[PDB]
């Protein structure tokens, strides 16, 4: 199926060991990023080959090492399925080296390894991640050859640095890292070369491919080029009995759960066979009569009366529907559909059928018409003949990159709850005070998570929770690795960077102290 | 509103109730029986915990706890069931009418005081907590006591006493050859007298249509999913409650029964060793996961610890402009947050101030939500919701906060690369005309779940052993005939303008 090859270039130079007091060294951040990447790759049980090459090591292990070239470069591990051995090597037996090395030589050896090892196996995505400080000398004579080789081999390249393109610094705390003026001339020189090579590789978008260790620890950017694509659901959007547009629907947003499931085993043997689960059906009587499973029948409750309902009878009388139906029931003003009533556990993104021009233009025309008229389509959805029919709303979504329909399920009459709540505006007992209103206004203004950039007169989100990875998976991977490497040891606490990424920037916290105290003093709250 | 709802059906058994002014029209007794059966079915489907009773007065035979003459209590206050529905249906038809006449009789004297007294006694017999005590009088006589004035006075006194006790009485007056006048005698017995309902009624009561309109949707009383704490700061906390204004409806779970006798069967699950066969305590077992050639062993307590970050509740983050909340970023159905004040005092005022200021500034409160212990935290947005009421001053949107879950990075999925193709203005105009041709008004309660309705109808047919289940009407179908008729030739023009002549959009 889908397979990928990844090469991790690790800087172990002396400069990496150097650090400022109170700030974690770049080597530690790179190690954490690599550990997270390997954790996700191995615990996800995905078939992708991973290789690790270290540049700056005291020793030398490289096919191109011979010839007094590419010295102090070692290939820790060639392309192979990730295993706990790589994680163990990262954790303990990979220490910084006192010998500096050129990152361009590291890239060259990585490309050579990719070319040599990628002969007997099929791959569709090659990606190389380079972690350096850019505080060492380098030779630019080989820039053209490496760029040409990258273009010819179609190999993606990513760079991670300890700084990004003044309170205490935190790992993934949504705050500034590596304050300005702390950059020497060597990294300044390296910045232009890395930027131009990335631009040549991709262009302007390549500028976004240079991340930072702290940024990468909370952005899920390492897997951006390795992530797969969900399958497509083909159907026909039909407005009437004649019009029909071939469409493909993908799951734009779906809650992600752990694929692997905990298996119950006996403590003495730690094997599945020892534990056996049995179900016994017995009657409600003093004798405790036992009845066979086949004897059991299905029934339903009818208000204190039990009415038998055999499974075969239910199947015969069950409501029958035609599978794979995407029909437009009607068109209604977008104001008549409210986000409150959205139901379901998924959102569908519907595009035209791949490799189809007439369908593409028809769908584009429909999307443009809906946007211009400010309307949405109430439609009937059915995954297959066995899936229960649903009523949903499809609305246009037009972007410079693409235009597509967005489908979200809508509720039925039986799914609506009518609850009455006493009005708060008309409640004199709970009526607020003008000073309280001013205090709440000040608190809200202080704790704004969006900043108004006057240079472009735009809004920038200081706390983009949508980009934060789910912490549960990271915690599970950390605990599993700790247990595997340390069978006899209590599980470690939550990593600091996880809390930092799950917490708001320190700026709003510091700017909200006085308003919060004002709220506390002006609002008498007594527990009951 | 706490407690059950009790209903008593008072059906007159006089001679006039068995005569129809017109031909081929169901008699008042048959209409009352049909309405009672419909109410029974509606109660069974919606709320089966309510209590319903059926009492007949004016008959010859008597069956009461007080041994009052000419009053028969067919069914005491009890939960509705199929047996009661069948018993009522036994008298539905003309043959059933004759069977009822033979079994009880008719054309016998009665007193409203006695029937009200027995109804009150039946209400007292109930041992649960009743949130509503109601009586329905199915009769077609507007002057039950005209010959004797003492009986009328006693009936009025009993009705007043029942009204003070807390019993709500309604008169489901039926068709009368001379017309029904509520103001004559029943004006002082009805709990609430409507000004409009004062003229002489020459037809059936409008409430009969409402009663006969069966409802097949479960009704759930207001209940808080969880009472949590919103923490603006460590030292600042308020108490709020979370409700599910929208919840998916699932059919009742199947029940295992003994095929031989159709009785409940107890299900027991046991775990035993394959080598010893003895029962295993929870500590005996352990949780293990296999990754390649490596095995990791964790205990249940450790596994629960794995997913644990903070205590249950809502931790308030900074506020965010509502413009940044994408409408297509939907992950889970939203919830409703409303102040509780049952745990911490003074939270209502702070909630109201926050709601007012959020509405004024058009911002949403970003928060970290943890529903229960040992549950990973999620990110939510509380969007202000101002109270909105439709005509007749009836609330349609309660005031509070709308809790919307913001998907994580892992939740989002990348889409395959696509190439944008634009449509010419003529195609856009044609499609706009097509869309306008099918414009319609959408409401949240404009559709019915076909599966649930079909299941309910099949269950009712099986319970009542009807000739055939009532086939439901699938309002979710597109009814392409009307769309075709309205569109006319527009579809052909769009197809010939967009689709090449040789397309065949079928394979």
């Amino acid at each position: 199926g889908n397979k990928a090859a990844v090469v991790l270039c690790m800087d172990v130079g002396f400069t990496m060991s150097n650090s400022i007091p109170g700030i974690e060294s770049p080597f530690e951040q790179a190690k954490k990023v690599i550990t997270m990447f390997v954790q996700r790759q191995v615990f996800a049980e995905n078939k992708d080959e991973i290789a690790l090459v270290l540049f700056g090591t005291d020793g030398t292990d490289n096919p191109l090492s011979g010839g007094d070239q590419y010295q102090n470069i070692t290939v820790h591990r060639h392309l192979m399925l990730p295993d706990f051995d790589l994680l163990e090597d990262i954790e303990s037996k990979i220490q910084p080296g006192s010998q500096q090395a050129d990152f361009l030589d590291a890239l060259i050896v990585s490309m050579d390894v990719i070319q040599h090892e990628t002969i007997g196996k099929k791959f569709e995505k090659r990606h190389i991640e380079i972690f350096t400080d850019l505080s060492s000398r380098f030779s630019k004579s080989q820039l053209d050859i490496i760029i040409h080789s990258l273009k010819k081999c179609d190999i993606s390249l990513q760079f991670f640095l300890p700084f990004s393109l003044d309170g205490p610094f935190r790992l993934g705390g949504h705050g500034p890292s590596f304050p300005l003026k702390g950059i020497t001339e060597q990294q300044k020189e390296g910045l232009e070369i890395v930027k131009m090579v990335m631009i040549s590789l991709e262009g302007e978008d390549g500028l976004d491919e240079i991340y930072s260790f702290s940024e990468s620890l909370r952005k899920l950017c390492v897997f951006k080029k390795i992530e797969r694509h969900s399958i497509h659901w083909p159907c026909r959007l039909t407005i009437g009995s004649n019009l029909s547009i071939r469409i493909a629907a993908y799951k734009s947003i779906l809650q992600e759960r752990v694929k692997k499931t905990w298996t119950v085993v006996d403590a003495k043997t730690l094997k599945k066979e020892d534990i056996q689960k049995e179900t016994v059906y017995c009657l409600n009587d003093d004798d405790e009569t036992e009845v066979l499973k086949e004897d059991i029948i299905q029934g339903f409750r009818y208000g204190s009366d039990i009415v038998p309902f055999s499974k075969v009878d239910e199947e015969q009388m069950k409501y029958k529907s035609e599978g794979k139906c995407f029909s437009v029931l009607g068109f209604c003003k977008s104001s008549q559909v409210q986000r409150r009533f959205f139901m379901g556990n998924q959102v569908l993104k519907v595009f035209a059928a791949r490799d189809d021009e007439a369908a593409a233009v028809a769908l584009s025309s429909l999307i443009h018409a809906l946007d211009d008229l400010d309307m949405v389509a109430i439609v009937r959805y059915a995954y297959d003949k066995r899936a229960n029919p649903q009523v949903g709303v499809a609305f246009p979504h037009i972007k410079h990159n693409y235009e597509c329909l967005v489908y979200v399920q809508l509720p039925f009459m039986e799914d609506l709850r009518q609850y009455m709540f006493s009005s708060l505006k008309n409640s004199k007992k709970y009526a607020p005070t003008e000073a309280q209103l001013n205090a709440v206004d000040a608190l809200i203004d202080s704790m704004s998570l969006a900043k108004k950039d006057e240079k472009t007169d735009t809004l920038e989100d200081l706390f983009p929770t949508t980009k934060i990875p789910n912490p549960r998976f990271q915690r599970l991977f950390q605990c599993l690795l700790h247990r595997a490497l340390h069978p006899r040891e209590p599980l470690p606490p939550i990593q600091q960077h996880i809390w930092n990424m799950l917490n708001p920037p320190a700026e709003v916290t510091t700017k909200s102290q006085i308003p919060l105290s004002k709220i506390k003093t002006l609002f008498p709250l007594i527990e009951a | 509103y706490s407690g059950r709802d009790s209903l008593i059906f008072l059906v007159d058994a006089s001679k006039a109730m068995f005569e129809s002014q017109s031909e081929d029209e169901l008699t008042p007794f048959d209409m009352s029986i049909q309405c009672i059966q419909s109410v029974y079915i509606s109660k069974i489907i919606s709320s089966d915990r309510d209590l319903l009773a059926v009492v007949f007065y004016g008959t010859e035979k008597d069956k009461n706890s007080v041994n009052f003459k000419n009053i028969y209590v067919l069914q005491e206050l009890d939960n509705p069931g199929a047996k009661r529905i069948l018993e009522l249906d036994q008298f539905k038809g003309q043959q059933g009418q004759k069977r009822f006449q033979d079994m009880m009789g008719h054309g016998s004297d009665y007193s409203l005081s006695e029937v009200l007294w027995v109804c009150a006694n039946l209400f007292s017999d109930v041992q649960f907590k009743m949130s509503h005590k109601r009586i329905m009088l199915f009769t077609n006589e507007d002057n039950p006591h005209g010959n004797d004035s003492a009986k009328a006075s006693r009936a009025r006194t009993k009705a007043g006493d029942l009204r003070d006790t807390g019993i709500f009485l309604d008169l489901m007056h039926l068709k009368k050859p001379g017309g029904f006048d509520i103001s004559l005698f029943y004006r002082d017995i009805i709990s609430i007298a409507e000004d409009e309902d004062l003229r002489v009624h020459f037809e059936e009561s409008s409430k009969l249509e409402d009663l006969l309109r069966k409802v097949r949707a479960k009704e759930t009383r207001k209940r808080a999913l969880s009472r949590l704490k919103l923490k603006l700061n460590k030292d600042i906390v308020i108490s709020v409650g979370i409700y599910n204004l929208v919840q998916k409806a699932l059919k009742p779970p199947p029940i295992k029964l003994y095929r031989e006798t159709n009785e409940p069967v107890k299900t027991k699950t046991r775990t035993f060793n394959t080598s010893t066969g003895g029962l295993l305590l929870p500590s005996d077992t352990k949780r293990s996961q296999i990754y390649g050639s490596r095995q990791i062993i964790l205990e249940k307590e450790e596994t629960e610890e794995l997913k644990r970050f903070d205590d249950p509740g809502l931790m308030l983050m900074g506020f965010k402009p509502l413009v940044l909340l994408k409408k297509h970023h939907y992950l889970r159905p939203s919830l409703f947050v409303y102040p509780e004040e049952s745990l911490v005092i003074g939270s209502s005022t702070l909630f109201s101030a926050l709601l007012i200021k959020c509405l004024e500034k058009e911002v949403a409160a970003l928060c970290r939500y943890t529903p229960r212990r040992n549950i990973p935290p999620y990110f939510v947005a509380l969007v202000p919701q101002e109270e909105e009421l439709d005509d007749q001053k009836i609330q349609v949107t309660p005031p509070g906060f709308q809790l919307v879950f913001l998907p994580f990075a892992d939740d989002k999925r990348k889409m395959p690369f696509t190439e944008k193709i634009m449509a010419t203005p003529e195609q856009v105009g044609k499609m706009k005309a097509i869309v306008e041709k099918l414009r319609f008004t959408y409401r949240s309660d404009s559709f019915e779940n076909p599966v649930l309705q079909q299941h309910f109808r099949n269950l009712e047919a099986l319970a009542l052993d009807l000739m055939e289940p009532e086939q439901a009407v699938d309002l979710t179908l597109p009814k392409v005939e009307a769309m075709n008729k309205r569109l006319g030739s527009l579809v052909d023009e769009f197809k010939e303008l967009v689709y090449p002549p040789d397309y065949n959009p079928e394979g």
């Binding site: 029931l329 009607g330 109430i378 009459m413 009518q418 | 509103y1 709802d5 109410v39 509606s42 109660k43 919606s46 709320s47 949130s131 509503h132 109601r134 409430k207 409402d210 009663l211 309109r213 409802v215 949707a217 009704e219 009383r221 007749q392 009836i394 099918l438 414009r439 319609f440 008004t441 409401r443 309660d445 404009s446 559709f447 019915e448 309002l475 979710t476 009814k479 009307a482 309205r486």
Partner: peptide, 23 residues
Amino acid sequence: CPGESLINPGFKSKKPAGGVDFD
């Protein structure tokens, strides 16, 4: 008070489903 269901007190009488009614 007005519009209250006669079968289930405390719940407004739900309007019967109208499906789709083109204007």
